[PDB]
Amino acid sequence: TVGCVVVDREGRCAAATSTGGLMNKMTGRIGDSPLIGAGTYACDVCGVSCTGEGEAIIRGTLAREVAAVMEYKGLKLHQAVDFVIKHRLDEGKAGLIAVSNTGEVACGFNCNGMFRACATEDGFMEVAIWD
């Protein structure tokens, strides 16, 4: 699974996710990646793309949830991300990347690691595997 979330200079969020799905998956199996609210979501406030165990990301509505906890619990992005990994996963292994409309950027996961990279216009730039 690959993905990319962006907030531009106009404050506009967008997200994109693409995958081959789970190795050895049954013919016609559909994971979280093409499901809006599960593997991918973007609204006024944020842009989110997920990766990991599809079945666990679907039942967790992970991507939408990042936006949900910011709208209703008014959390910050990095918290919303981490709140979501903690309480929506229940033994399922996943991760995600997100931006907010304020130019913030977060990753979060509960796997051993996640191939990710992030940047902001003020000049932040990280590329990571573990952490």
Binding site: T1, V2, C4, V5, V6, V7, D8, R9, G11, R12, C13, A14, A15, A16, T17, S18, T19, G20, G21, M23, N24, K25, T27, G28, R29, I30, G31, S33, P34, I36, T40, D44, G47, T51, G52, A94, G95, L96, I97, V99, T102, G103, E104, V105, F109, C111, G113, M114, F115, R116, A117, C118, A119, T120, E121, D122, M125, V127, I129, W130
Partner: protein, 157 residues
């Protein structure tokens, strides 16, 4: 008030992955983020940036998408993708793709050039041709690295 961008290549890393493979991965991630960073400095809308960055992630065989996709129990490739544009919450998604070279672009097309949010399998293949996107044989998507990992997976039961 500034742009930001992230890019990923899948959670769940080989807990022992060589530094060699790690460097390739980081290099790919860097190259992709760079396309994104440059697009954003030139004021490309976010929805265009996510698409162009994921095409690069789909084309390069390293990660599990496009060429380099994981294999089904049948040892072929079925690909899926989705895309969303925050401001009007506009959606496009595709599943069950077997010939489409860049699934994310087909998803963009679902969103912009179809009355629907989500088209899958044969109907999505047909839409690919209606829209004249690059299509190839399913073999194009299969890497020897992946064929090996399936063999290993099917035995693992």
């Amino acid at each position: 008030g500034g742009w930001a961008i992230a890019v990923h290549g899948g959670a769940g890393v080989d807990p022992t992955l060589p530094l060699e493979r790690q460097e390739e991965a980081k290099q790919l991630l860097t190259r992709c983020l760079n396309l994104g960073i440059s697009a954003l400095n030139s004021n490309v809308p976010a929805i265009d940036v996510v698409e162009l960055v994921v095409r690069e992630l789909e084309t390069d065989p390293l990660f599990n998408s496009g060429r380099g996709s994981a294999l089904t129990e049948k040892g072929t490739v079925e690909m899926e993708a989705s895309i969303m544009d925050g401001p009007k919450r506009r959606c496009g998604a595709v599943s069950g793709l077997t010939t489409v070279k860049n699934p994310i672009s087909l998803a963009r097309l679902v969103m912009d050039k179809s009355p629907h949010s989500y088209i899958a399998f044969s109907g999505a293949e047909d839409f690919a041709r209606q829209q004249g996107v690059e299509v190839v044989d399913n073999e194009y998507f299969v890497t020897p690295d992946n064929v090996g990992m399936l063999k290993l997976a099917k035995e693992a039961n």
